[PDB]
Amino acid sequence: DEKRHLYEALLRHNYFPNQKGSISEIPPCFSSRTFTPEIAELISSDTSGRRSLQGYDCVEYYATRYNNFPRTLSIIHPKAYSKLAKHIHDNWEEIRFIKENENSMIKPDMHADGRIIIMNYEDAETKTIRELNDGFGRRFKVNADISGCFTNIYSHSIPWAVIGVNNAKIALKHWSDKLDYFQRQAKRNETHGVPIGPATSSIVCEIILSAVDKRLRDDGFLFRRYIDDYTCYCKTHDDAKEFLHLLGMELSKYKLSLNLHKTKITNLPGTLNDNWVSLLNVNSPTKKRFTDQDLNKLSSSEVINFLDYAVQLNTQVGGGSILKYAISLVINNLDEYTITQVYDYLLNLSWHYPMLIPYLGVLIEHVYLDDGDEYKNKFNEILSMCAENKCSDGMAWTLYFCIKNNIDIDDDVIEKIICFGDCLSLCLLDSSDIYEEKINNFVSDIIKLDYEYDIDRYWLLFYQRFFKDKAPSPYNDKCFDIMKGYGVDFMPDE
């Protein structure tokens, strides 16, 4: 069944921010499997406990973008997420009209690993064929995106996009009103915005934006969208302006607006990908496959010169993930001679850009971690700069690399981790069990603060301490006991 696949995707595969297909933003130690639909069905049925504050807060995660910009990802509290996932699954025969959208390329799908929503899984060549077919006969292309799409979704516009704005306002129950209420309860009983990273909020965004896709399709516009990004192919510049006007109208019906910084009109024929994609791919040492494994093992000079050229291209243009794409080009084709030099280049670059920190794990097996103690200082310096820059992706990834490889962590960097106080870093330190007393003092300060939302911001840490029998449940409800009794661990071992 496909409805069951929705349930398993919502709980076990796309509860955490696992939407990136190439490499996960969150380290693989955190996971959402062994969170079975029966367990969420039990949590939703539970009525025990009482909360003074309406709604729930979410575990916060700050991931660096390509330009070192913070992006806010959220891990929803399992009570609110369990109710939301149950309500989404129980009415998928009313919701699955977002599956049959030809203008939304990123949408729920029945993937092999189990996830419904994977960002850029269709790859650039199937994208190339479609882009070539759409671009034919048109001499203008429009790139326009919503300004704050996930962060300013009006939750009360969830019923509207289901049944029309006017009919829903006149009717002021229906399933989409309850979906509105559950999406509000997921984030502090707040109508504006949705959490970023779970697939329930991406489902909500698909539901809202599918009405705009429908009323743009009915006017005969040939357009595609990737979440919030609309690309349009117009024979005339006038039809391009008319598309921008109609998109503004239909988004303003749902309290949404265009990002006019990124909204631009270009003259076809333009590049199908970005420019630096083609510049890196013509200069790539691995752009030709020789079908024998010895011939495509790159020497040290080729990888070093390609990485230097990629650094120059990223500095000169700065309009995309030049370094991410470049190191993902040449990291699997190395031989054992240049493994250490490339690892040193990656260490320097991953200090200078935290986004390149997850790549180290693919070369961390071949590099001898002990060596002359130098790599311990490498990882501790990276941890210190991750604490200062208040980034969560690189900091948690570096904790994962230090713990998984038995690399010691200094006390001063533990103290500035404490000062940073991001939830998943503290969950990793909790999993280390060395710093149990300092984690105990931190969660004790959270407890004596007496704020429900501050406990909800670290529910993952509190539940992980409960699962190893090191802390009582801060909540008076039985959701944590239901999760523990049925075997839910968000740091599972093999």
Contacts with Mn ion, residue ranges (CB under 5 A): 145-146, 149, 228-229
Which region among 16-24, 212-220, 269-277, 278-286 touches ligand DCP (by CB under 6 A)?
16-24
Number of residues near ligand DCP (by CB under 6 A): 19
Q: How far is the CB of 57 from a copy of itself (least distance, A)?
A: 11
Considering only 193, 197, 198, 474, the residue that binds a copy of itself (CB under 8 A) is 193
Binding to DNA by residue 286, rule CB under 7 A? yes
**Which 22-81 residues touch DNA, going by CB under 7 A?**
22, 65-66, 71
Closest CA to 89 of 33, 44, 47: 44
Q: Which does 99 bind (CB under 5 to 8 A by kind): ligand DCP, DNA, Mn ion, none?
A: none
**Min separation Cβ 247 and DNA, Å:** 16
Question: CB under 8 Å to 344, separation ≥6 — which residues?
Answer: none
Residues 299-328 that bind ligand DCP (CB under 6 A): none
Q: Tell me the per-residue interface mask from 183 to 222 with ligand DCP, x by CB under 6 A, - otherwise.
A: -------------xx-------------------------
Q: How far apart are CA 484 and CA 490, in angstroms?
A: 11
What backbone phi and psi angles, to 5 degrees, belong to 459?
-55, -35
Q: Token pair of 273, please?
A: 């990908």
206 binds, among a copy of itself, ligand DCP, DNA, none (CB under 5 to 8 A by kind): none
Position 348 contacts a copy of itself (CB under 8 A) = no
Question: How many residues sit in the footprint of a copy of itself (CB under 8 A)?
Answer: 24
Question: CB under 8 Å to 257, separation ≥6 — which residues?
Answer: 146, 147, 248, 251
For a copy of itself, which residue of 97, 309, 451, 486 counts as binding (CB under 8 A)?
451
- Encoded one letter per residue, x for contact with a copy of itself by CB under 8 A and - for no contact, window 365-394 reads -----------------------x-x----
- Contact status: 424 vs ligand DCP (CB under 6 A): no
Q: Does 297 bind DNA (CB under 7 A)?
A: no
- Is residue 111 involved in binding DNA (CB under 7 A)? no
Residue 256 in contact with ligand DCP, rule: CB under 6 A:
no
Q: Which is nearer to ligand DCP, 81 or 467 (CB)?
A: 81
Residue span binding a copy of itself (CB under 8 A) among the ranges 37-45, 244-252, 339-347, 481-489: 244-252
CA distance linking residue 86 with residue 35, whole number of Å: 13
Instruction: Please give the residues from 260 up to 289 whose contact with a copy of itself meets the rule CB under 8 A.
Output: 260
End-to-end CA distance of the chain: 28
- Which of 93, 125, 292, 373 binds DNA (CB under 7 A)? It is 125
Could you tell me which stretch among 15-23, 269-277, 337-345, 454-462 binds ligand DCP (CB under 6 A)?
15-23
* CB 491 within 8 Å of CB 31: yes
**Can you tell me which of 47, 166, 267, 291 binds a copy of itself, judged by CB under 8 A?**
166
Q: For residues 155 and 184, is the Cβ–Cβ distance under 8 A?
A: yes
Q: Which of 98, 186, 329, 471 binds DNA (CB under 7 A)?
A: 329
Residue 145 in the binding site for DNA (CB under 7 A): yes
Q: Under the criterion CB under 6 A, does residue 227 sit at the interface with ligand DCP? A: yes
Our finding on whether 420 is near ligand DCP (CB under 6 A) is no
Nearer to DNA, 17 or 78 (CB): 17
Q: Which of 277, 339, 418, 434 binds DNA (CB under 7 A)?
A: 277
As measured in angstroms, the least distance from the Cβ of 476 to ligand DCP is 32
Smallest distance from the beta carbon of 220 to a copy of itself, in angstroms?
20
192 binds a copy of itself (CB under 8 A): yes
3-state DSSP of the chain:
CHHHHHHHHHHHHCCCCCCECCCCCCCCCCCCCCCCHHHHHHHHHCCCCCCCCCCCCCEEEEEECCCCCEEEEEECCHHHHHHHHHHHHHCHHHHHHHCCCCCECCCCCCCCCCCCCCECCCHHHHHHHHHHHHHCCCCEEEEEEECCCCCCCECCHHHHHHHCHHHHHHHCCCHHHHHHHHHHHHCCCCCECCCCCCHHHHHHHHHHHHHHHHHHHCCCCCEEEECCEEEEEECCHHHHHHHHHHHHHHHHCCCCCEEEEEEEEEECCCCCCCHHHHHHHHCCCCCCCCCCCCCCCECHHHHHHHHHHHHHHHHHCCCCCHHHHHHHHHCCCECCCCHHHHHHHHHHHHHHCHHHHHHHHHHCCCCCCCCCCHHHHHHHHHHHHHHHHCCCHHHHHHHHHHHHCCCCCCHHHHHHHHHHCCHHHHHHHHHHCCCHHHHHHHHHHHHHHCCHHHHHCCHHHHHHHHHCCCCCCCCCCCHHHHHHHCCCCCCCCC
Q: Quick one: which segment of 156-164, 196-204, 327-335, 446-454 binds DNA (CB under 7 A)?
A: 327-335
Note the residues at the interface with a copy of itself (CB under 8 A): 52, 68-70, 148, 166, 169-170, 172, 190-193, 245, 248, 252, 257, 260, 388, 390, 449-451, 454
Give me the residues that bind ligand DCP (CB under 6 A), please: 17, 19-20, 25, 71, 73, 145-151, 196-197, 227-228, 259, 262
